[PDB]
């Protein structure tokens, strides 16, 4: 069924699974026209497809040309997401194909179920977790590749850097979700926390800075304070 706090360790077992988040697929800026009406201008987007056990991120960049001349773009964006996820699973060797795909928004269920009808053995599941993957475009290297794209492109990343050499995938996912939740709640402050000390750098082949184990504890504490401090000032506690 649905994925929630009760079955959270299932994410880190040995059954291949992918989260799919569609919240950055169709992105627009809203602006005034010369006549004083409102119009939208699309900007490049991305599908966020993540294996939470390994950190492997399949970032399919959605170039604005895909929207040209199309209607009902927010509806189309869900179907385009499902088309691209189906294409990805079909590009993978059978032994790498997921046994479950967890969608972060329930509106993706029927689109994904229709593209993957012929795969009756891949479970398409929703979740009750409120995961912060929308904040992926606050990761500078991810935002950069999306905005620079001049055509459709798939780019592969490991969203955990080398963390799995030292920590488990449960702990890595928890760190990732903490970082993203912070970036979502207060992007400027979160980014200040991550880059305050110039001596800690981001390797060319990494997304996040090269924190020692002790520095990660400090970082994580700073981020937990950002989230709780912003939650307590918002819900009057």
């Amino acid at each position: 069924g649905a994925m929630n706090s009760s079955n959270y360790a299932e994410l880190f077992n040995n059954d291949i699974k992918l989260f799919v988040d569609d919240t950055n697929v169709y992105r627009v800026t809203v602006h005034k026209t010369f006549e004083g009406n409102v119009a939208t201008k699309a900007i490049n987007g991305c599908i966020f497809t993540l294996n939470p056990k390994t950190g492997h991120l399949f970032l399919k960049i959605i170039h604005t040309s895909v929207w040209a001349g199309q209607k009902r773009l927010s509806q189309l964006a869900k179907w385009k997401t499902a088309e691209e996820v189906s294409a990805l699973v079909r590009s993978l060797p059978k032994e790498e194909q997921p046994k479950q795909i967890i969608v972060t928004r329930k509106a993706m269920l029927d689109p994904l179920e229709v593209h993957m009808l012929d795969f009756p053995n891949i479970a398409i599941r929703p979740t009750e977790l409120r995961l912060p993957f929308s904040a992926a475009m606050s990761i500078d290297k991810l935002s950069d590749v999306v905005m620079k794209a001049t055509e459709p492109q798939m780019v592969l990343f490991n969203i955990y850097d080398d963390w799995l050499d030292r920590i488990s995938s449960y702990t890595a996912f928890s760190r990732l979700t903490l970082l993203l939740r912070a970036l979502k709640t207060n992007e400027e402050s979160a980014k200040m926390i991550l880059l305050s000390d110039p001596t800690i750098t981001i390797k060319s082949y990494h997304l996040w800075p090269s924190f020692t184990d002790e520095q990660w504890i400090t970082i994580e504490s700073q981020m937990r304070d950002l989230i709780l401090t912003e939650y307590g000032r918002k819900y009057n506690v």
């Binding site: 189309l76 179907w79 499902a82 088309e83 029927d110 689109p111 229709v114 593209h115 009808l117 012929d118």
Partner: protein, 300 residues
């Protein structure tokens, strides 16, 4: 005008013959139903006074043979049978009529209700949905499941309605995943009408039979089929005008006949609200929308 005699009525039972019903007391001298209109299918139907559970009955067409009812005390139900001896049958019937031991099919002359509910229903198609080839009539009861229900357990006792499934390979073309799911016209017109049913009359006949099974026996799986066949049309942007007009008439008479106190278990809120207010055909069912709004506005 044809006749279905009863050998006797040993157990107290409510007997139906299409929309009409009457109560027969234990061992009451009831010997059948006369003046049954020729030209239509009919359904006789029963509910034991002691066990309102398992309402059951028989679809038949008197043009296809001489049929009668006889209670079986072993299997505990009223069974339809065919009498092959035409002279024995004529003699039985003429005697029961002389003794006035039969109820008359009570059709009002103005009244087209049964025709309107069975316009496209043919015995030959009933017998393909309900497979028991040794009889010319077809038994149905409240508990019988459908083929599609069995896929989600005795196949001989199943309702073989045409399986409709909106998230299936049959309903969706590869490369038209979104198009076919949001506009079911190719599934309706090519897969089902041209491919499976051959014409809209056969489609409407199955839809009407599903409704009647749902309304007369509470066959849940019949109800699922009726709503699925409505939704398939309403969710198609391209439907022949004559089919939409006939569907509006079909559904109008179904809603009109539907007994008020079973509305909650015979009408699916989601399907009807979607069909009347959101679908491509939201503005094409004027008669049905008017009767629904005046008879069951709660559901909407």
């Amino acid at each position: 005008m044809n006749t279905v005699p009863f050998t006797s009525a040993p157990i107290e039972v409510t007997i139906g013959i299409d929309q009409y019903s009457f109560n027969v007391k234990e061992n009451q001298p009831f010997h059948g139903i006369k003046d049954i209109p020729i030209g239509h299918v009919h359904v006789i139907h029963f509910q034991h006074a002691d066990n309102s559970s398992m309402r059951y009955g028989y679809w038949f067409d008197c043009r296809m043979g001489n049929f009668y009812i006889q209670y079986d005390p072993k299997d505990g139900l009223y069974k339809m049978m065919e009498e092959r001896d035409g002279a024995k049958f004529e003699n039985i019937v003429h005697n029961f009529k002389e003794r006035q031991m039969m109820v008359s099919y009570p059709k009002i002359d103005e009244d087209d209700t049964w025709y309107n509910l069975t316009e496209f229903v043919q015995m030959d198609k009933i017998r393909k949905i309900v497979r028991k080839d040794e009889n010319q009539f077809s038994y149905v009861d409240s508990s019988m499941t459908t083929v599609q229900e069995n896929e989600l357990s005795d196949p001989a006792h199943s309702l073989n309605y045409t399986v409709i499934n909106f998230k299936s390979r049959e309903a969706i073309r590869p490369g038209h995943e979104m198009e076919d799911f949001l506009d079911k016209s190719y599934y309706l017109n090519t897969v089902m009408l041209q491919g499976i049913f051959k014409n809209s009359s056969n489609y409407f006949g199955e839809l009407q039979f599903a409704f009647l099974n749902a309304m007369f026996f509470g066959n849940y799986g019949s109800s699922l089929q009726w709503h699925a066949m409505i939704e398939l049309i309403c969710s198609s942007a391209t439907v022949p005008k004559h089919m939409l007009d006939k569907l509006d008439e079909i559904l109008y008479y179904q809603i009109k006949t539907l007994p008020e106190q079973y509305s909650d278990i015979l009408l699916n809120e989601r399907v009807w609200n979607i069909c009347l207010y959101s679908s491509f055909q939201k503005n094409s069912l004027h008669n049905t929308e008017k009767i629904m709004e005046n008879k069951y506005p709660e559901l909407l």
